[PDB]
Subunit: 239 residues, 3 copies
């Protein structure tokens, strides 16, 4: 590539145009919360063999993030929404159509899990495997890329703690899952503080201030954080 000028492909041309425009037709800002993933990590380590044996797919952290985010989009319908700046009307989507960022040799794509609110953790794990595979092997259909109401992007896959991901209207939010890192943190029990090692992650949420304010974003991220930290997912694994 070095020392050359080359025309970009259609996917990269559209990405360049849409991201420049997206920032000018929305009011983006990125709120950041930290989440203790230790209990999810222990649950995943304990149940991974039985999960793979019963459902036929590997159990990663992604279905836990997806389950929590989709439940929070149902509980906070104001975030699963779109604003029309010409009519000043807000549309609150009944479907949670979750876009996921996927890496392909031709560029990043955002295929969609339609009606993700009806899916269990085993169904989510299978849908991720299917979308990632077809995205990398050029087997996506136009329906796989349209209708998204919210996006999740795994920025931690290449080592980042956090980012300010660009949302694409008509969506109102895009959540990044940063790298999960062991850190010394403070634990409080019966008013006594102590230092312990925990698996911590940053969850940066880019949100559109036309649709969501700082308090709305914080309540939505708190629902996600508390669901993941409690890690009451054994029943959800359907073992």
């Amino acid at each position: 590539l070095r020392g050359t000028t080359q025309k970009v492909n259609r996917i990269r041309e559209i990405t360049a145009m849409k991201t420049v425009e997206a920032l000018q037709i929305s009011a983006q800002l990125t709120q950041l919360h930290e989440v203790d993933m230790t209990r999810v990590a222990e649950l995943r380590k304990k149940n991974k063999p039985a999960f793979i044996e019963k459902h036929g797919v590997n159990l990663t952290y992604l279905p836990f993030f997806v389950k929590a985010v989709v439940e929070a989009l149902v509980s906070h319908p104001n975030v699963n929404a779109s604003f029309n700046a010409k009519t000043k009307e807000m549309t609150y989507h009944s479907s949670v159509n979750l876009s996921i960022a996927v890496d392909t040799p031709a560029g990043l794509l955002t295929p969609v899990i339609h009606d993700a609110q009806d899916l269990s953790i085993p169904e989510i794990a299978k849908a991720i495997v299917d979308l990632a595979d077809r995205s990398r092997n050029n087997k996506l259909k136009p329906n796989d890329l349209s209708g998204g109401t919210f996006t999740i992007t795994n920025i931690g896959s290449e080592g980042a703690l956090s980012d300010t991901p660009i949302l694409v209207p008509p969506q109102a939010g895009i959540l990044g899952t940063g790298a999960i890192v062991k850190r010394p943190v403070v634990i409080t029990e019966d008013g006594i503080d102590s230092i312990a090692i925990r698996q911590m992650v940053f969850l940066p949420l880019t949100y559109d201030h036309q649709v969501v304010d700082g308090a709305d974003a914080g309540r939505f991220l708190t629902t996600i954080k508390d669901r993941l930290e409690t890690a009451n997912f054994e029943g959800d694994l359907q073992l």
Copy 2:
């Protein structure tokens, strides 16, 4: 429930949507982040809270400490308490510090203003915050309570956030977020010896307009705030 419907938004949401989209296009916003050790303020607040409530008739929270430090820094850094005219290329440095504070209401977030905040003590700030929060919730704010802001503080930690990139509204040049105050293991140095101690740490993200403030100006302004809060010499300021 809201799901499956299309609804016209209220006047606050409509103006907020319009102003925030436009604000980002008539300024050059970026957010610098510093960490501040609030342990000494936390201990001072815990020790003096009963005497403060008894004398001044108001609860002592962290907010008057953040307000007092930010307003002192806006006086010491008049270049931050300022507005830029992009047509004439002139900067106006405001002699008044009119501090806007983000407040929650049933109809949405508002930013009422503490006018001439540079003349106020911590007890006067605590009383002004109680008055503004009460009238904001009970729909008794007047137009003079919402105009003339020269800088804003928003408590993004009230809903759990560590940090954010809050949107600044021109003609203001800065908006400071106060993140959640969290106990963390940190390195302390005493008599040349490093050790690990538990401290109450907060992130202070400052969104600033690069038309008015550069990265070094922002850093010097946040350092004045950080040093004031970390030294926590506020006992005389409490007027007990």
Copy 3:
């Protein structure tokens, strides 16, 4: 004179900075990815070799030549980051030269002088070039060539205490890296499968990048190359002592 209570026209640097930064955000798609880097081994190497470095090369050894050397090597191995996008023709230009801009403080404001063809320079040559550019910036001895042709920028946001920032990128550049404050922190260390807590010098490296040129995965790969180079800290030979 005193600013408070006055209206004053800004100087040329502030006027150009106000125009370029407002416009830059509207002709690019900026976002800032953040990574943490353990600078302890670089700090120890710098402390150990600082006297021999200033004795042989005549200039002080700071952290900046280490950041510059790592960033310039990564700009050569990630040519997609040392690049510019033409939104009219939809063509990407991958620059063969690494012309590294560095933010410098002056009495009149911040400037970004450029180290041209930085890919050919050693750490001693980088250290000498930084001293020269910082001096000529503060004493108004810069020639127009010292401010043009930049392909990437490094800004030391940690010099005034910041952990991180979302620095504004100036097109046609595709990235700007901030070096946050280097702070001692308790971190987890793993040795033979055993975790322990140790004190390490940690730094945040926020990279603002243009999504027209670089995506989140590209940014992460580029920052991982820089992070691994700095954490390994195999720079003794590079110091040419």
